[PDB]
Amino acid sequence: MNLRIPWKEVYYLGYNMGNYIKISEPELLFVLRNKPQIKDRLKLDEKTIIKEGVKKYKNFWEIYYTVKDLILRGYRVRFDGFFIELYEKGIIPGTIEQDYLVYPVSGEIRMTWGELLDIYNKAIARKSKFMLAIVDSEGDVTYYEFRKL
Amino acid sequence: MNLRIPWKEVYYLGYNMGNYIKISEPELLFVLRNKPQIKDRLKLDEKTIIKEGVKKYKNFWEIYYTVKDLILRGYRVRFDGFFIELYEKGIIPGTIEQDYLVYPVSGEIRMTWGELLDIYNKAIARKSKFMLAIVDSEGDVTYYEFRKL
């Protein structure tokens, strides 16, 4: 989960700890499937990482698919353990504050309006804008801003 | 439920049918508690109207409280049976399109992200912006825009 690999070669995902990149399972899962040569220079399987991602995050797949869509669109992101930090194209994460904290979910997973308020409030408590990412059954992602008036 | 009363004296709530105002229970409930003289010129009780409002709308109170907050803030609104149509101050409803379709809920009532998408889509299908109104346990209302990026 700690990659001794230059930050840029893992798309600037995870946290740059200087001597390694501390990276989450869904982010790492993406790196594996897009950098096959790194899959060996590490020799781990996306069966095992998938396996542990699901164990760790109820919304593993939603995180993975949202990271994937965003990185492929050219955005820079970093998973904080709850929110995906979304930065403009060309920005290196941590270098400035993210534009959005994005919360990834799928359409079927349940919620109360009270839960939405809690999530939004957490983003406000970190002084940033809030975005919901909904991943549908084909793994496609749509995005919605939610903001108090 | 049909008031033979000039539109302006019921705050421009309900639908102006020319010879009467077709008004909903939560809107009417508000009129009753703010125009006591009209409560008699009509001689109905907010026990009975409350009673039938709840029978008709699962979110009766949330509608009532949101109408109330908005009308007292000076906005013009009209309940469409699902959304509250929100117009700028000074506007007469129907006269132009509403600025928002607002959907009123309370924090404890359940939801899936799929439900939020459906509600939002209905507002988009009517070509207008979408606002969620959350009424808390003291009847206070907070407002949030939700929009696709």
PDB file of N, CA and C in Angstrom, chain A residues 100 103 105-117 119-121 131-132 134 142-149, chain B residues 100 103 105-117 119-121 131-132 134 142-149:
ATOM      1  N   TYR A 100     -13.036  20.713  -4.916  1.00  0.00           N
ATOM      2  CA  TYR A 100     -14.177  20.049  -4.307  1.00  0.00           C
ATOM      3  C   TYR A 100     -13.738  18.902  -3.444  1.00  0.00           C
ATOM      4  N   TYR A 103     -18.070  13.187  -2.766  1.00  0.00           N
ATOM      5  CA  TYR A 103     -18.500  12.019  -2.062  1.00  0.00           C
ATOM      6  C   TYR A 103     -19.137  11.062  -3.067  1.00  0.00           C
ATOM      7  N   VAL A 105     -21.090   7.703  -4.341  1.00  0.00           N
ATOM      8  CA  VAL A 105     -22.146   6.783  -3.944  1.00  0.00           C
ATOM      9  C   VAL A 105     -22.715   6.106  -5.197  1.00  0.00           C
ATOM     10  N   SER A 106     -23.586   5.126  -5.005  1.00  0.00           N
ATOM     11  CA  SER A 106     -24.367   4.586  -6.125  1.00  0.00           C
ATOM     12  C   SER A 106     -25.839   4.791  -5.832  1.00  0.00           C
ATOM     13  N   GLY A 107     -26.639   4.885  -6.892  1.00  0.00           N
ATOM     14  CA  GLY A 107     -28.067   5.221  -6.799  1.00  0.00           C
ATOM     15  C   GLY A 107     -28.936   4.384  -5.869  1.00  0.00           C
ATOM     16  N   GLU A 108     -28.552   3.128  -5.650  1.00  0.00           N
ATOM     17  CA  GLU A 108     -29.360   2.233  -4.831  1.00  0.00           C
ATOM     18  C   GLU A 108     -29.036   2.312  -3.339  1.00  0.00           C
ATOM     19  N   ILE A 109     -27.824   2.734  -2.988  1.00  0.00           N
ATOM     20  CA  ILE A 109     -27.461   2.771  -1.569  1.00  0.00           C
ATOM     21  C   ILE A 109     -28.213   3.870  -0.807  1.00  0.00           C
ATOM     22  N   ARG A 110     -28.784   3.491   0.331  1.00  0.00           N
ATOM     23  CA  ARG A 110     -29.777   4.316   1.025  1.00  0.00           C
ATOM     24  C   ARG A 110     -29.203   5.568   1.712  1.00  0.00           C
ATOM     25  N   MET A 111     -30.094   6.478   2.105  1.00  0.00           N
ATOM     26  CA  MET A 111     -29.705   7.749   2.710  1.00  0.00           C
ATOM     27  C   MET A 111     -30.879   8.430   3.387  1.00  0.00           C
ATOM     28  N   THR A 112     -30.615   9.189   4.444  1.00  0.00           N
ATOM     29  CA  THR A 112     -31.597  10.171   4.895  1.00  0.00           C
ATOM     30  C   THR A 112     -31.088  11.573   4.576  1.00  0.00           C
ATOM     31  N   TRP A 113     -32.011  12.526   4.529  1.00  0.00           N
ATOM     32  CA  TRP A 113     -31.637  13.899   4.255  1.00  0.00           C
ATOM     33  C   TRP A 113     -30.699  14.351   5.350  1.00  0.00           C
ATOM     34  N   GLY A 114     -30.840  13.744   6.523  1.00  0.00           N
ATOM     35  CA  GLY A 114     -29.974  14.049   7.646  1.00  0.00           C
ATOM     36  C   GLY A 114     -28.547  13.619   7.372  1.00  0.00           C
ATOM     37  N   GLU A 115     -28.399  12.533   6.621  1.00  0.00           N
ATOM     38  CA  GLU A 115     -27.083  12.026   6.257  1.00  0.00           C
ATOM     39  C   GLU A 115     -26.408  12.962   5.262  1.00  0.00           C
ATOM     40  N   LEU A 116     -27.181  13.445   4.296  1.00  0.00           N
ATOM     41  CA  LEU A 116     -26.669  14.374   3.297  1.00  0.00           C
ATOM     42  C   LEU A 116     -26.165  15.649   3.963  1.00  0.00           C
ATOM     43  N   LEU A 117     -26.923  16.136   4.940  1.00  0.00           N
ATOM     44  CA  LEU A 117     -26.542  17.333   5.680  1.00  0.00           C
ATOM     45  C   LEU A 117     -25.226  17.107   6.416  1.00  0.00           C
ATOM     46  N   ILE A 119     -22.791  14.931   5.683  1.00  0.00           N
ATOM     47  CA  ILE A 119     -21.697  14.864   4.708  1.00  0.00           C
ATOM     48  C   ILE A 119     -21.367  16.276   4.251  1.00  0.00           C
ATOM     49  N   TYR A 120     -22.385  17.017   3.840  1.00  0.00           N
ATOM     50  CA  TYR A 120     -22.153  18.367   3.354  1.00  0.00           C
ATOM     51  C   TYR A 120     -21.455  19.206   4.416  1.00  0.00           C
ATOM     52  N   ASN A 121     -21.916  19.073   5.663  1.00  0.00           N
ATOM     53  CA  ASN A 121     -21.359  19.848   6.786  1.00  0.00           C
ATOM     54  C   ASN A 121     -19.887  19.555   7.021  1.00  0.00           C
ATOM     55  N   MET A 131     -19.409  18.106  -3.642  1.00  0.00           N
ATOM     56  CA  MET A 131     -19.916  17.522  -4.868  1.00  0.00           C
ATOM     57  C   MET A 131     -20.290  16.086  -4.577  1.00  0.00           C
ATOM     58  N   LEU A 132     -21.445  15.665  -5.062  1.00  0.00           N
ATOM     59  CA  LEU A 132     -21.839  14.269  -5.006  1.00  0.00           C
ATOM     60  C   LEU A 132     -21.514  13.594  -6.348  1.00  0.00           C
ATOM     61  N   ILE A 134     -22.405  10.225  -8.427  1.00  0.00           N
ATOM     62  CA  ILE A 134     -23.246   9.053  -8.464  1.00  0.00           C
ATOM     63  C   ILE A 134     -22.745   8.091  -9.550  1.00  0.00           C
ATOM     64  N   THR A 142     -21.875  10.545 -12.743  1.00  0.00           N
ATOM     65  CA  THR A 142     -22.369  11.878 -12.938  1.00  0.00           C
ATOM     66  C   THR A 142     -22.165  12.668 -11.656  1.00  0.00           C
ATOM     67  N   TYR A 143     -22.058  13.982 -11.805  1.00  0.00           N
ATOM     68  CA  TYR A 143     -21.627  14.836 -10.727  1.00  0.00           C
ATOM     69  C   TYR A 143     -22.636  15.912 -10.447  1.00  0.00           C
ATOM     70  N   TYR A 144     -22.823  16.236  -9.164  1.00  0.00           N
ATOM     71  CA  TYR A 144     -23.794  17.266  -8.763  1.00  0.00           C
ATOM     72  C   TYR A 144     -23.245  18.120  -7.645  1.00  0.00           C
ATOM     73  N   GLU A 145     -23.296  19.426  -7.810  1.00  0.00           N
ATOM     74  CA  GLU A 145     -22.942  20.276  -6.697  1.00  0.00           C
ATOM     75  C   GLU A 145     -24.132  20.322  -5.745  1.00  0.00           C
ATOM     76  N   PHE A 146     -23.854  20.389  -4.452  1.00  0.00           N
ATOM     77  CA  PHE A 146     -24.897  20.582  -3.438  1.00  0.00           C
ATOM     78  C   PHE A 146     -24.382  21.699  -2.562  1.00  0.00           C
ATOM     79  N   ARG A 147     -25.137  22.793  -2.446  1.00  0.00           N
ATOM     80  CA  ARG A 147     -24.669  23.916  -1.646  1.00  0.00           C
ATOM     81  C   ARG A 147     -25.812  24.658  -0.981  1.00  0.00           C
ATOM     82  N   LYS A 148     -25.551  25.108   0.237  1.00  0.00           N
ATOM     83  CA  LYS A 148     -26.559  25.810   1.023  1.00  0.00           C
ATOM     84  C   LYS A 148     -26.747  27.211   0.461  1.00  0.00           C
ATOM     85  N   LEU A 149     -27.979  27.698   0.443  1.00  0.00           N
ATOM     86  CA  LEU A 149     -28.231  29.068   0.002  1.00  0.00           C
ATOM     87  C   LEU A 149     -28.391  29.977   1.208  1.00  0.00           C
TER      88      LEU A 149
ATOM     89  N   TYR B 100     -37.143  28.632  -8.882  1.00  0.00           N
ATOM     90  CA  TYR B 100     -36.837  27.282  -8.439  1.00  0.00           C
ATOM     91  C   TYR B 100     -38.088  26.469  -8.278  1.00  0.00           C
ATOM     92  N   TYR B 103     -38.268  21.296  -3.268  1.00  0.00           N
ATOM     93  CA  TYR B 103     -38.822  20.092  -2.732  1.00  0.00           C
ATOM     94  C   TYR B 103     -38.584  20.084  -1.224  1.00  0.00           C
ATOM     95  N   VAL B 105     -38.640  18.595   2.584  1.00  0.00           N
ATOM     96  CA  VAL B 105     -38.482  17.348   3.318  1.00  0.00           C
ATOM     97  C   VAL B 105     -38.061  17.668   4.758  1.00  0.00           C
ATOM     98  N   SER B 106     -38.018  16.652   5.608  1.00  0.00           N
ATOM     99  CA  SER B 106     -37.396  16.807   6.930  1.00  0.00           C
ATOM    100  C   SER B 106     -36.244  15.828   7.041  1.00  0.00           C
ATOM    101  N   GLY B 107     -35.263  16.173   7.872  1.00  0.00           N
ATOM    102  CA  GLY B 107     -34.009  15.415   8.000  1.00  0.00           C
ATOM    103  C   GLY B 107     -34.106  13.922   8.286  1.00  0.00           C
ATOM    104  N   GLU B 108     -35.185  13.502   8.943  1.00  0.00           N
ATOM    105  CA  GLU B 108     -35.328  12.102   9.323  1.00  0.00           C
ATOM    106  C   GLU B 108     -35.977  11.238   8.241  1.00  0.00           C
ATOM    107  N   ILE B 109     -36.764  11.842   7.353  1.00  0.00           N
ATOM    108  CA  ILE B 109     -37.444  11.038   6.336  1.00  0.00           C
ATOM    109  C   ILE B 109     -36.469  10.478   5.292  1.00  0.00           C
ATOM    110  N   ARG B 110     -36.592   9.182   5.029  1.00  0.00           N
ATOM    111  CA  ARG B 110     -35.570   8.428   4.298  1.00  0.00           C
ATOM    112  C   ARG B 110     -35.495   8.741   2.794  1.00  0.00           C
ATOM    113  N   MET B 111     -34.412   8.296   2.158  1.00  0.00           N
ATOM    114  CA  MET B 111     -34.160   8.570   0.745  1.00  0.00           C
ATOM    115  C   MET B 111     -33.078   7.669   0.183  1.00  0.00           C
ATOM    116  N   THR B 112     -33.160   7.347  -1.102  1.00  0.00           N
ATOM    117  CA  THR B 112     -31.983   6.835  -1.799  1.00  0.00           C
ATOM    118  C   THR B 112     -31.471   7.897  -2.766  1.00  0.00           C
ATOM    119  N   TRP B 113     -30.207   7.768  -3.150  1.00  0.00           N
ATOM    120  CA  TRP B 113     -29.623   8.708  -4.085  1.00  0.00           C
ATOM    121  C   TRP B 113     -30.407   8.628  -5.373  1.00  0.00           C
ATOM    122  N   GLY B 114     -30.999   7.465  -5.623  1.00  0.00           N
ATOM    123  CA  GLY B 114     -31.820   7.267  -6.802  1.00  0.00           C
ATOM    124  C   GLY B 114     -33.073   8.119  -6.747  1.00  0.00           C
ATOM    125  N   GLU B 115     -33.584   8.329  -5.539  1.00  0.00           N
ATOM    126  CA  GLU B 115     -34.768   9.153  -5.341  1.00  0.00           C
ATOM    127  C   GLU B 115     -34.448  10.620  -5.601  1.00  0.00           C
ATOM    128  N   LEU B 116     -33.291  11.061  -5.117  1.00  0.00           N
ATOM    129  CA  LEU B 116     -32.850  12.434  -5.321  1.00  0.00           C
ATOM    130  C   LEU B 116     -32.702  12.731  -6.809  1.00  0.00           C
ATOM    131  N   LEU B 117     -32.138  11.777  -7.542  1.00  0.00           N
ATOM    132  CA  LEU B 117     -31.963  11.921  -8.982  1.00  0.00           C
ATOM    133  C   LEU B 117     -33.316  12.057  -9.671  1.00  0.00           C
ATOM    134  N   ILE B 119     -36.201  13.147  -8.370  1.00  0.00           N
ATOM    135  CA  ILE B 119     -36.781  14.454  -8.044  1.00  0.00           C
ATOM    136  C   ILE B 119     -36.085  15.517  -8.879  1.00  0.00           C
ATOM    137  N   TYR B 120     -34.761  15.515  -8.855  1.00  0.00           N
ATOM    138  CA  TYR B 120     -34.018  16.519  -9.598  1.00  0.00           C
ATOM    139  C   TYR B 120     -34.387  16.473 -11.075  1.00  0.00           C
ATOM    140  N   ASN B 121     -34.486  15.256 -11.617  1.00  0.00           N
ATOM    141  CA  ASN B 121     -34.803  15.061 -13.042  1.00  0.00           C
ATOM    142  C   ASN B 121     -36.163  15.623 -13.418  1.00  0.00           C
ATOM    143  N   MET B 131     -34.162  23.052  -5.879  1.00  0.00           N
ATOM    144  CA  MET B 131     -33.743  23.424  -4.542  1.00  0.00           C
ATOM    145  C   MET B 131     -34.370  22.447  -3.572  1.00  0.00           C
ATOM    146  N   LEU B 132     -33.585  21.973  -2.620  1.00  0.00           N
ATOM    147  CA  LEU B 132     -34.103  21.169  -1.527  1.00  0.00           C
ATOM    148  C   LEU B 132     -34.336  22.068  -0.301  1.00  0.00           C
ATOM    149  N   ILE B 134     -34.966  21.765   3.696  1.00  0.00           N
ATOM    150  CA  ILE B 134     -34.986  20.859   4.819  1.00  0.00           C
ATOM    151  C   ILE B 134     -35.595  21.561   6.040  1.00  0.00           C
ATOM    152  N   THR B 142     -33.893  25.314   5.991  1.00  0.00           N
ATOM    153  CA  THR B 142     -32.693  25.683   5.296  1.00  0.00           C
ATOM    154  C   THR B 142     -32.780  25.177   3.865  1.00  0.00           C
ATOM    155  N   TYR B 143     -32.063  25.851   2.976  1.00  0.00           N
ATOM    156  CA  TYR B 143     -32.224  25.647   1.559  1.00  0.00           C
ATOM    157  C   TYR B 143     -30.922  25.279   0.909  1.00  0.00           C
ATOM    158  N   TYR B 144     -30.978  24.369  -0.067  1.00  0.00           N
ATOM    159  CA  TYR B 144     -29.767  23.917  -0.771  1.00  0.00           C
ATOM    160  C   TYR B 144     -30.031  23.752  -2.249  1.00  0.00           C
ATOM    161  N   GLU B 145     -29.193  24.345  -3.075  1.00  0.00           N
ATOM    162  CA  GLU B 145     -29.309  24.069  -4.489  1.00  0.00           C
ATOM    163  C   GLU B 145     -28.661  22.715  -4.758  1.00  0.00           C
ATOM    164  N   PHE B 146     -29.222  21.965  -5.694  1.00  0.00           N
ATOM    165  CA  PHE B 146     -28.620  20.708  -6.152  1.00  0.00           C
ATOM    166  C   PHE B 146     -28.634  20.799  -7.659  1.00  0.00           C
ATOM    167  N   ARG B 147     -27.466  20.703  -8.296  1.00  0.00           N
ATOM    168  CA  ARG B 147     -27.418  20.824  -9.746  1.00  0.00           C
ATOM    169  C   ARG B 147     -26.320  19.972 -10.354  1.00  0.00           C
ATOM    170  N   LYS B 148     -26.626  19.415 -11.516  1.00  0.00           N
ATOM    171  CA  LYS B 148     -25.690  18.538 -12.210  1.00  0.00           C
ATOM    172  C   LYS B 148     -24.575  19.375 -12.817  1.00  0.00           C
ATOM    173  N   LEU B 149     -23.351  18.868 -12.789  1.00  0.00           N
ATOM    174  CA  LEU B 149     -22.241  19.570 -13.430  1.00  0.00           C
ATOM    175  C   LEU B 149     -21.959  18.955 -14.790  1.00  0.00           C
TER     176      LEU B 149
END
